[PDB]
């Protein structure tokens, strides 16, 4: 049976193309769409990522990052998993990384997609690739930040070598919530692991 089987949404905060779309999707994943004037509690809410209205009672209020990546994992994930699957709050109107570069590690499809949106919208450029001298042939800027999920892989030896801070994502979510740049010495990905 669908991913969604069993399960009902509301689709809320959306122009009328993407309300549409994603309506679409979780049909086509077996998901009920349901009314703002339903009978019953939906079992979700399906929001934008910095949340919007939601004015009826529902089991979980979740955003279309949550749900894409349930559909390309085919897995449903619980919301409370990452915090891009529920709304995330941010200062409106404040550019606190206008002067930082950043690259992402370990991050794919959605996850990475908003979080690009995220640093974007905070004033950052992001770069595909992380270097640490600019390459005006390539179109490449140095990063002066790496934000990942683990200790490993290549970009977090390279900031390691190049000493560059690499942080956690928290580090771009507080940023966010504050519209202030976050102390990266309180988020470092080497000081992350627990248990």
């Not at 690009?116 to 450029?125: E, I, P, R, V, W």
């Not at 390459?135 to 934000?147: D, P």
């Not at 940023?175 to 692991?193: C, P, Q, V």
Request: glycine share 6%; proline share 4%; charged share 20%.
């Amino acid at each position: 049976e669908g991913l969604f089987s069993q399960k009902s949404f509301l689709v809320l905060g959306f122009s009328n193309e993407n309300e549409s779309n994603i309506a679409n999707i979780i049909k086509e994943n077996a998901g009920k769409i349901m009314s703002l004037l339903s009978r019953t509690v939906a079992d979700y809410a399906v929001v934008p990522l910095l949340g919007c209205e939601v004015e009826a009672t529902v089991g979980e209020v979740v955003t279309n990052t949550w749900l894409v990546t349930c559909i390309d994992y085919q897995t449903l994930f619980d919301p409370k998993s990452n915090p891009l699957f529920t709304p995330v709050p941010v200062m409106t109107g404040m550019t606190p990384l206008e002067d930082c570069v950043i690259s992402f590690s370990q991050c794919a499809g959605a996850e990475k997609e908003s979080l690009t949106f995220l640093a974007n919208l905070l004033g950052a450029s992001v770069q595909e690739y992380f270097v640490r001298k600019s390459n005006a042939k390539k179109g490449m800027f140095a990063s002066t930040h790496l934000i990942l999920k683990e200790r490993g892989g290549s970009k977090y030896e390279a900031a390691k070598k190049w000493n560059l801070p690499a942080v956690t994502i928290a580090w771009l979510l507080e940023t966010a919530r504050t519209g202030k740049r976050a102390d990266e010495s309180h988020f470092l990905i080497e000081n992350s692991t627990k248990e």
